[PDB]
Ligand SMILES: *[C@@H]1O[C@H](CO)[C@@H](O[C@@H]2O[C@H](CO)[C@@H](O)[C@H](O)[C@H]2NC(C)=O)[C@H](O)[C@H]1NC(C)=O
Ligand SMILES: *[C@@H]1O[C@H](CO)[C@@H](O[C@@H]2O[C@H](CO)[C@@H](O)[C@H](O)[C@H]2NC(C)=O)[C@H](O)[C@H]1NC(C)=O
Ligand SMILES: *[C@@H]1O[C@H](CO)[C@@H](O[C@@H]2O[C@H](CO)[C@@H](O)[C@H](O)[C@H]2NC(C)=O)[C@H](O)[C@H]1NC(C)=O
């Protein structure tokens with residue numbers, strides 16, 4: 001299944017404040033009006049970066065796995081939100097062929113709806129941006145525009161080329177595109193142009 | 196149109212803003228700094244004229 | 245530099261200045277003080293875990309603790325008076341506070357006093373050969389202090405062991421924990437002790453009455469690592485007080501400059517650190533300690 005990435009997958013590329021200005025920036029973004037793969041939990045590549053989105057009514061999706069082999073051989077990322085707490089670990093975990101949830105750890109951290117995330121892995125840093133929005137749609141991604149603020153920057157230095165999800169959702173692949181971003185008075189990105 | 200904006204630039208401060216190592220290197224280039232100031236000053240006086 | 249007319253004369257390279265107005269110099273306010281601001285020190289490295297450990301490992305089975313993703317306060321160590329040996333090779337302790345590293349390894353073990361000398365680059369002996377070897381290019385610190393009060397008891401503490409025989413010398417940071425019967429002769433032992441068949445390990449005699457040379461010493465060896473990865477072990481990088489409405493030389497988390505810092509009315513987003521102008525010029529910051 002495939003759907004249209006209308007204007008989604010814009011994130012603040014840097015931590016800089018800018019107001020009432022159009023700034024041109026080259027980085028890994030989700031190309032406008034591209035094909036996003038639609039899923040109702042296989043293993044997917046991580047070419048240079050991933051745009052994940054999930055439409056949720058009951059918070060079925062919980063986590064992500066990232067790495068190269070993801071079979072207790074090498075370092076791999078596991079990210080999990082369990083009902084109250086977020087957990088991140090980078091152990092060489094022994095995963096099942098079809099891991100899920102019921103109804104050498106070199107790092108550890110503990111903390112109707114659309115949840116959009118961007119994962120990218122640059123200079124050994126794992127950058128995670130996200131945005132939560134209310135929606136009234138059961139078919140596909142809402143058309144419109146909203147920016148993703150960074151949430152986490154993990155200094156892992158771990159090679160990732162593949163990933164998988166842990167529980168419907170959509171996947172897009174980022175590309176090195178130049179964008180023009182419109183920052184309003186409040187420093188929020190309100191519109192963008194794919195150059 | 197009759198006049199422009201009478202801009203002036205301090206070459207030193209532009210190139211080597213508040214840096215001593217940079218300034219000492221810049222001295223080796225001679226009068227570039229001075230001649231740019233001089234040219235722009237020329238422009239500004241022309242604007243008034 | 246006598247008087248402005250002289251500055252003029254020098255600028256024009258003449259003794260005779262014609263009537264006019266001459267641009268001679270450039271007025272620039274000098275910064276009065278230096279401001280350094282970094283975020284509140286948080287997530288200290290677990291040095292306590294290693295130094296304040298209740299029990300230590302034997303030298304042949306020396307413990308290795310990995311230190312990562314934390315702020316390493318070396319001051320608490322090199323300013324402490326609890327250490328007899330604080331030797332650092334190819335690095336100064338004080339400087340460590342200004343440095344980041346990918347990984348730090350705290351190798352902890354116990355030896356006798358006279359063997360402390362073997363824990364150094366280019367040393368030989370039972371310890372340096374069969375138990376714990378430092379590389380010739382070691383660039384870390386060795387900390388050792390007497391532990392007679394803890395690791396000695398009336399009648400002799402024999403919990404601490406050392407390897408007495410080995411078929412070859414250890415490589416730098418090699419760990420051998422094998423208990424294979426040492427074949428001193430030509431006859432295979434087949435895991436049976438006897439003539440030319442000896443157990444490779446032996447106990448230390450740690451009594452409170454023992455000579456300082458034979459008294460137990462706790463040793464921590466800090467090794468510093470720079471990989472193809474982010475440096476996650478950094479020093480405290482101490483801050484200063486903040487001064488407003490003055491020309492200052494400021495340093496915020498990454499960025500330096502010179503200016504006058506004033507109360508702004510800008511509305512940064514919770515994640516935005518420093519603001520910019522049209523001309524990609526830093527115009528505003530967020531103080532890391534006070535938002
Ligand atoms: C989510 O799972 C995590 C672990 O995967 C749970 O975190 C642990 O909580 C207990 C009790 O507070 C602690 O003793 C552990 O140290 C925690 N683990 C870690 C890794 O720090 C957490 O309790 C779970 N969430 C909920 C809501 O129960
Ligand atoms: C920036 O955000 C602020 C706060 O949400 C907005 O300021 C408010 O604007 C409304 C409508 O003019 C006023 O009723 C409020 O009194 C304002 N509040 C404050 C605290 O100033 C502002 O409109 C936003 N600007 C943009 C461009 O989005
Ligand atoms: C950094 O640490 C300082 C000192 O503990 C914190 O300053 C306090 O801030 C609160 C809230 O504004 C004030 O009520 C207190 O008066 C401050 N304490 C002192 C001793 O002056 C500050 O909040 C911390 N900031 C961060 C980002 O961690």
Ligand SMILES: *[C@@H]1O[C@H](CO)[C@@H](O)[C@H](O)[C@H]1NC(C)=O
Pocket residue numbers: 002003035
């Ligand atoms: C992109 O999506 C359209 C509409 O679903 C489809 O016809 C086309 O084959 C897709 N492109 C690729 C490269 O698969």
Ligand SMILES: *[C@@H]1O[C@H](CO)[C@@H](O)[C@H](O)[C@H]1NC(C)=O
Pocket residue numbers: 104
């Ligand atoms: C644990 O990870 C480290 C990473 O440097 C690696 O060197 C080591 O071989 C791993 N240990 C095991 C037992 O797999």
Ligand SMILES: *[C@@H]1O[C@H](CO)[C@@H](O)[C@H](O)[C@H]1NC(C)=O
Pocket residue numbers: 157159472
């Ligand atoms: C990541 O993969 C590339 C390409 O295979 C390889 O050159 C590099 O060594 C890998 N990184 C690590 C840390 O092993």
Ligand SMILES: *[C@@H]1O[C@H](CO)[C@@H](O)[C@H](O)[C@H]1NC(C)=O
Pocket residue numbers: 291292295296320
């Ligand atoms: C060990 O604890 C004592 C207080 O009981 C303290 O003086 C010392 O600083 C601690 N060790 C380290 C390495 O901080």
